Amino acid sequence: QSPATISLPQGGQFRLSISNTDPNMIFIPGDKVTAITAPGGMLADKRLTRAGGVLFTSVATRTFTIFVETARGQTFSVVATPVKGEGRVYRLMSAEPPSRPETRKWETAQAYEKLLISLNRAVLTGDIPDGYGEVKPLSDGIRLPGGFSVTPLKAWAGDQLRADRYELRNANTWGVALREQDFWKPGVRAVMFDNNAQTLMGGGRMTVTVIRGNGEG
């Protein structure tokens, strides 16, 4: 089994299922939960982990609303239905990137093309910068030209820059030569191909790292 990811905005409210006898956990991929509030006499016990998540146990039977609050400045409400069963794990993905003034200092301290290079090498290798945090990928973030389809995989955001990885599939039988520029949409800032490819044969499986301005447009 894998944790369930729901991706609510800062205004999001999600009807999930909570357990009764055994404890449950909700954690933020990129933020540390600091407070959690529920109707009085509903949450039996709560504990904060070192990683930054929250372990809570609900002994009540009525459906209730819980608010979770993080350190970077974030608040997500979830509606829990108490059912008898095993504990459940939820991955509360952000969906609207958080504000991180400490990250902006590192982002702006250095040059620009260098910063683009760095953020891209990292996406390629997997060594994500310390300030960057996992955010919901943009469903439609790049121009799709003439027969490609896209699906989203991962996304990392700081303050002024984003980063997305998009799996491209070529529906067209004929192989299509692709140039980075085709993909430009207003608000993107670099398009790089992992496997440097002059052309993509049909049935292609090529991922492309595109970065955008955070909140721009």
């Binding site: 030569a177 140039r179 002059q198 052309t199």
Partner: peptide
């Protein structure tokens, strides 16, 4: 048709 290819161009870089």
């Amino acid at each position: 048709v290819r161009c870089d």
